[PDB]
Design a binder for this molecule. Structure first.
Ligand SMILES: O[C@@H]1[C@@H](O)[C@H](O[C@@H]2CO[C@@H](O)[C@H](O)[C@H]2O)OC[C@H]1O
Ligand code: NI
Length: 376
């Protein structure tokens, strides 16, 4: 049974032989390298006394996926000061009140707050919502907007499900198949965006009128991942049609950056809501695929395993996600090896560090039993 039921989180690092003291130190150090004043590794920057943001170092912009990740990291680390700085920046510069996507958050902004687009990114919205629910549960709702956390979360999820009903807007989930979309105006998805474990919680905390829907979305996403992951390699494409096959119209039909999160998501869902034969086998497939491959040689791969000459742009992130996936197959043949590889991998430096480091901290929290569900 998952932690949702037992309220006990597996410390896989400890189960694999690492000492409690060294694990505590490593988690704290990872956080400090990302959120502290460590120039070469940091991804979080503070502005004034009430603002802050996470910088996509590779694209030199601020993204909702990153900001929502930051809020989730902050609430897991019990750092309301950082959570509020990020959420404040998000509401001030990213929330849209005009255009067809009013009610959603502009997905990319410049560091000064200027919006680079008026289009949103569903994976950002879903993380904002759960992070907000967790904030409400750990610290209680604030007296002034936008710090009335739980209300903000329910409001956002209302839009995600009902936008378009009486307006030109579009929902972020297809109402018929209950699957999250890549973006509001298209009819295809992105495997890495599927968070059934998040939807399970939304079915308990979202507006009551949508709780049944969220339970159905959780089930739909679990079934979707089964048809999206290659049967032999376990690799999932970045973008995929609702039928599960890759959408490579613009080059996103292979195993690359977005895809890495699938293994991590499967690992967290297993830890929170229980393991499954499919999940264990899926993680075993992915880890088996990388068992004989060196990180320095990781490439972009077709989901069937065929390698491209192009190297992985975020190999550290790949390592982190594969290790986090071990939570779904603790007795897997490569589970220990993956966790050890991750432990032996330093936080990334350089201009492409942002994505790797976000995945790195999530894996550090999950593998140490610190990526928890915060109940009311
Ligand atoms: O085309 C845009 C997408 O690229 C964008 O998706 C983001 C890309 O970076 C990923 O790391 C994020 O997870 C994802 O949100 O969404 C908006 C869309 O217009
Ligand atoms: Ni030490």
């Amino acid at each position: 049974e998952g932690a949702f039921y037992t309220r006990e989180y597996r410390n896989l690092f400890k189960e694999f032989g690492y000492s409690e003291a060294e694990i505590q130190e490593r988690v704290k150090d990872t956080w400090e390298q990302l959120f502290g004043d460590n120039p070469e590794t940091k991804i979080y920057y503070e502005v004034g006394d009430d603002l802050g943001y996470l910088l996509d170092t590779g694209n030199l912009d601020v993204r909702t996926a990153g900001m929502s990740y930051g809020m989730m990291m902050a609430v897991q680390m019990d750092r309301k000061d950082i959570f509020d700085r990020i959420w404040n920046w998000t509401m001030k510069n990213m929330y849209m009140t005009e255009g067809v996507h009013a009610g959603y958050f502009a997905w990319s902004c410049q560091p000064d707050g200027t919006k680079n687009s008026w289009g949103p990114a569903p994976d950002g919205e879903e993380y904002f919502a759960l992070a907000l629910f967790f904030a409400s549960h750990r610290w209680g709702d604030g007296d002034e907007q936008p710090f009335n956390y739980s209300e903000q979360a329910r409001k956002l999820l209302h839009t995600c499900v009902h936008n378009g009903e009486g307006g030109p807007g579009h929902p972020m989930w297809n109402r018929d198949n209950k699957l999250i979309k890549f973006i509001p105006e298209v009819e295809f998805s992105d495997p890495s965006y599927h968070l059934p474990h998040f939807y399970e919680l939304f079915s308990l905390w979202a507006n009551e009128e949508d709780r049944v829907f969220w339970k159905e979305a959780a089930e739909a996403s679990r079934e979707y991942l089964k048809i999206a992951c290659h049967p032999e390699t376990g690799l999932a494409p970045e973008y995929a049609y609702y039928d599960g096959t890759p959408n490579d119209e613009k080059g996103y039909g292979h195993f690359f950056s977005d895809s890495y999160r699938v293994a991590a998501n499967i690992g967290l869902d297993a830890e929170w809501f229980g393991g499954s034969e499919w999940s264990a086998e899926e993680i075993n497939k992915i880890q088996a695929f990388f068992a004989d491959k060196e990180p320095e040689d990781y490439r972009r791969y077709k989901i069937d395993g065929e390698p491209f000459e192009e190297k992985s742009l975020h190999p550290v992130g790949l390592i982190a996600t594969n290790a986090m996936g071990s939570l779904a197959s603790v007795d897997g043949p490569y589970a220990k090896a993956n966790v050890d590889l991750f432990w032996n991998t330093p936080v990334r430096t350089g201009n492409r560090r942002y994505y790797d480091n976000c995945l790195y901290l999530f894996a550090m929290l999950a593998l140490s039993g610190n990526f928890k569900i915060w109940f009311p």
